[PDB]
């Protein structure tokens, strides 16, 4: 075991470079986990892999706990690890080793009050698989008193939750004929459902500059076939929902938009959100401003551990981490070095701020 | 227009033979509709195609209405129309020209009290398409006071509604390896979800001889693929639900049965049921017994117009018609001549019995 | 930046719109230009998504196959339009 | 800093036939990222890196895809062999280096594009730019003009497909019908283009494949034909002609682009001429036989546009495609002088 | 020979576009009995000719159909196929 | 003649023309030499294009199965010709 | 009432090659329905019609599928030509007619099955019966025994597939390797079966197809082999041998069934012998070279089982497969006498 180092000595950029170097696509996080556990042990954590091989390092003492829930796995492939002009390139730099590195460093820097624990987790199998990491935590651990999810929100952004998701299927069957008028074929019928639904979504969210407060549709697949007697067509559509539009609402519109076809629907994700007024949000808004930032409340579009531990534990929860999420899963995924340390300072205060709330009780 | 004939003269077997002769797969019901409208006009109905080309014939007078909602379309193909040993073979004999023929004859035989209308409908596009017939009725007509759906229940059976339907998708992704132990591959994982879910359904409905009061699963599709790094698998499963097992209940079990995979779910049909104690049920139970039968309360498994006008109008509703529903969509679809006239006598009384309830008010 | 099925559906809308704009007010189909989306199929192999639309263009006398094809070709933004001529409209006095 | 030559072999060593450009694009972007470009692939898979700041943009549009065939990547006495050495990784590498070397005014940003699918009929790499980008103020197409050459234009392109069916019984074979169609098409083009000086002004059909097959009860035959068009003969006109020679079979046509040419006295031309001339060269203005993405972005954008790059275009698509390494250094410096002006 | 009878036989032989030979055969067989010189041409077109002279009247129809088969039957005066 | 397919087609055209020129002035088909292009196939591997033509000849006694090959051979300036002599003509005196 | 001959041409006129039995099955059931059977197709598509009442069941198991090839359906002086006239629509039609003609005791039900896929290796038509039905008290297999013949058994069947790959460079061709494998297999079987009297007791390999192809960089070759086994050589044993001769290639094997034979002195045999003899015939007990669904339902069910039907088995799968119409009438009456006893 390495000698104890200063939590202030190691920078997040330093830790991230080492962490981004080790390959860890989902299912193969073991060398990355071992390495990080060693690093955390050197920073004052008590670090060791749990039952599912998640990297877990703890600080503090007491009946109260702040969990920082990140993931150590990535999509496969190697983004050529390089640092050029104050920008770090590497797989997982944004999704989500950057936020994970920030968790480790800020957690070791943060001043804790008595009666407060701090558990930092580098979960496995979140990216390509069914999150064996987080599900193991739920099945084996008590619900902590606060959860910060390690996902890129930007250093000056704070994520309160995620948009709802709905998978739509429109299907239509029509008898064959020779006609070439409108709605003559099943494919035309399926295509026009897309247009009229696409039109509605634009109607609903007119003028809304907050993209996560819009309902945005997607035609993932359209197919058609015929047996000479009948023609059939199917349109598969994804709907990403703002908080003010429930699935069953959106599903009712789609259903009402279809006449000659039938619409079926799966709710992939119910919408989920920690309220703006909540203490944990107050802490992070305060933390960002305390370090010279103009904080933005936002929602994640894509799924994450927030989709699981949120509904499970029901505790106050936010997502925070440096990096531009648009760079997730990209061949040149990168993050500026400044944003890393800035987010580290902010999270340091936020952990202190949350621990202060919890200790006041 | 043909000369008025006696409603007693024409038998249901006579009408059905003529009706089963004319080809009418969904979308091509026009010659069948024209013919039936003529026949109904001869039987005392005022018969004429409506907006969607549905065959509609009315009797009686007043502010109250009993609708007999059947369909005139079938699946394509010709079952060689023949009568052998008191059995009528033909496409739609059971699904559902038999019940439709019974509707026409019994409706013209039935004694109506004052203030009661009787509308018999041979709807179109129910079988292969999205029920343009019934949807047109809903959009253009007032909700009637009672509805009988023309589907095969057997002459001595009465259908109170239908089972709920749930479409399940289990998906799993696992990293490739060389191992051959249990749960080594995604396909094995998908297959074992099927087994454990199939096992549960059997556990839930143990000893239940009422099949429609059981939860019965179906593996419609199982597929798998690999990119050399990861293996994926998908199992598509249908779940037919008894009334005492809601979708979200069954969806919760499936979700709980899956660990390494994720289950998504679409509710195809919410379960629906007219209660056993209701007046319309009392009428039909009475009608069957009045003509020497031991009535069976049952539910339809497959979808029908009952799935639409039921939730729409919300009026008391049953499904009744001669024929064995297991013969639906079969190359030798057939019905015994005795069952036709027996069901005709029963429905005649049932219409009178319902009209009596309605008139008493 | 979005899907192949969306791009193919985008092409159909453009063509459908154009033909409809051309054909306004005309009572007889023979003197109208009407498209027919006979098939629209998308697929995904994990690497590239692909979409193929099969369309029949019915032509009135006032619109030559050469012109229609030229129009169809110009409507495609990122896709690839492939065309085959049967015959132009023909009538006898 | 890296020379164009060290950049070229690295790119040439990474196979990128049309459809398989991803690893090449991926690698090229990090080479652009290491060099200081803000660089990632775009929505279509194009390799994109952009320089400078502001609302004014010069685009260096090259292509990273190549035709198939394995040309052994090697250096033989200052001569680099490899698929793409001329067409067109050479010009593309030149874009990456000269694009960084040059110094720009404020408000002027430079963008390097390694487009996908230029070699094939889709040209969807360029088409994605037309769909998703604002028109730049000028464009340089990355094709081999020669270190002392300036290409002002390329011929248009239409691909033709003839298919014919004949019963496998009694009464011309599918092959004979297909061949005679080719004979008709070849003759029509030859009689049209008779006595014309340069390839640019001629219409030339190309029989890339003819294959007859026996279905079982039918005889089948297909002919894959590329057609290269001069300004005088539009794709539309050429298809009408092709249609009129079909007879017993059917002709399926897919338009790439009409011919395109940059007017000889353009300021952007003068800039390159000077860059050539001032660097001790004797420039010859060229119009090429093949086609280019210039033929698409030209009529689309309308900005001043030329094609420039190291390499002899006659070596395009050849089994031993190669370029002298000396040509690379000059072309980079010349493009730079050109870029500045 | 009646038209409805020939058609009743004609519609009983499936001939989707590209698979016409059986129907073409049968038809050539029938036209001869009516006075034609019948023979499938180099393309497979059923061709029946009668008479001779400088002039010619061609009755040009088609034997192929779109796929999807309508069960062949006559009901209430109407032929389905 | 820049592709393999173009050369095979050209060999066929020139062979067909030669036979027709020879067979001119001849009364009956069984006295003419008749060429039949049974097949024509082409391929490419990126480096080389290849093509192959299957041409049948029906020979009258006035043209030998040896003079036929030699003529075909001389027409192949760039290509190569191989030949299968199934049978020469026979004619009872 | 309809004779077997009028029934046969109708069935023979409806093509039913393996995989395409539905219209034939569909039509046959209405013929069974018109004749008074409770008749519909089952879960696998078998044509099923059943007679009588009770817990005791005789099954007339025939098959409605045929091998491909169009045999013109015609009658030439009392001789019916057509694919399936012998194998095995003749016996199946005989089952339908004799099955209705006979009179049964109470508690005894008769069932006629026109199974699918008997001709091919799947035999899934019969396999569905094994999976979804209770074992009958006796079975008659619908294969051509001849009007005065009684088939007691058939050889087993194993299909073999040899595949070999060779690089298209330098050093035996794929074809040569595949051919030599066949040579080894053919020799092993011939040396095993040397001097054996009848086909039933010999092991005989069948080279149904050998095809070599050029992948591009590899030479490829595949050999489709059917293997017919005597009782002495099990499918298991025969596969082990086949495996041991693979050498450079691989052998893929699919078991149909082992050989099967009905013991000569069975009461069910006596019943048919009598039916033959009493109807003025000179019965010859036969054991056939090919295989049957008897080989599956036999070992599965274990009930008394024989094969009977009009037709000469040598005409099986031939371009002019045919049966004398006279043979049909006798076979129907003989089967009836047999059925009763
Ligand atoms: Cl010129
Ligand atoms: Cl022996």
UniProtKB/TrEMBL annotation, chains D, G:
Protein origin, superkingdom: Bacteria
An example molecular function term from Gene Ontology annotations: cobalt ion binding
UniProt keyword terms in alphabetical order: Amino-acid biosynthesis, Cobalt, Cytoplasm, Hydrolase, Lysine biosynthesis, Metal-binding, Zinc
InterPro entries associated with the record: ArgE/DapE_CS, LysK, Peptidase_M20, Peptidase_M20A
CDD domains per the UniProt record, alphabetical: M20_ArgE_LysK (cd05653)
Membrane spanning stretches: none
Coiled-coil ranges per UniProt: none
GO biological-process terms attached to the record: lysine biosynthetic process via aminoadipic acid
NCBIfam families, alphabetized: dapE-lys-deAc, PRK04443.1
HAMAP family listed in its UniProt record: LysK
Protein name, UniProt field: N-acetyl-ornithine/N-acetyl-lysine deacetylase
Species name: Sphaerobacter thermophilus (strain ATCC 49802 / DSM 20745 / KCCM 41009 / NCIMB 13125 / S 6022)
């Amino acid at each position: 075991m390495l000698e104890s180092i200063s939590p202030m000595s190691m920078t997040t950029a330093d830790l991230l470079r080492g962490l981004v170097s080790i390959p860890s696509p989902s299912g193969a996080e073991a060398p990355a986990v071992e390495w990080l556990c060693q690093q955390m042990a050197a920073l004052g954590y008590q670090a060791e892999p749990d039952g599912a091989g998640n990297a877990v390092g703890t600080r503090g003492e007491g009946p109260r706990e702040i969990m920082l829930l990140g993931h150590i796995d990535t999509v496969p492939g190697e983004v050529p690890v390089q640092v050029v002009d104050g920008v770090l390139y590497g797989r997982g730099a944004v999704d989500a080793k950057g936020p994970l590195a920030t968790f480790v460093v800020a957690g070791a820097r943060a001043k804790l009050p008595p009666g407060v624990r701090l558990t930092v987790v580098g979960a496995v199998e979140e990216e390509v698989m069914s999150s064996r990491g987080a599900r193991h935590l739920i099945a084996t651990r008590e619900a902590p008193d606060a959860v910060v999810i390690g996902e890129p929100s930007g250093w000056d952004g704070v994520v309160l939750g995620y948009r709802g998701s709905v998978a739509l299927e429109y299907r239509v069957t029509v008898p064959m004929s020779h006609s070439a008028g409108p709605e003559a074929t099943a494919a035309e019928l399926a295509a026009d459902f897309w247009y009229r639904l696409r039109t509605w979504c634009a109607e609903w969210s007119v003028g809304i500059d907050h993209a996560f407060h819009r309902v945005e549709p997607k035609l993932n697949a359209l197919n058609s076939s015929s047996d000479g007697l009948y023609g059939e067509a199917v349109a598969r559509i994804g709907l990403r929902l703002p908080p003010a539009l429930s699935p069953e609402e959106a599903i009712a519109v789609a259903t009402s938009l279809a006449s000659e076809g039938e619409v079926t629907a799966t709710v992939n994700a119910p919408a989920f959100q920690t309220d703006k007024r909540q203490p944990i949000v107050a802490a992070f808004l305060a933390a960002v401003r305390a370090h010279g930032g103009t904080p933005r409340l936002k929602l994640k579009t894509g799924t994450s551990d927030m989709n699981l531990v949120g509904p499970a534990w029901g505790c106050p929860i936010v997502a925070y981490g440096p990096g531009d999420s648009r760079l997730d899963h990209t061949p040149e995924e990168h993050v500026p070095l400044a944003d890393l340390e800035r987010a580290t300072a902010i999270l340091t205060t936020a952990i202190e701020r949350v621990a202060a709330q919890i200790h006041s009780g």
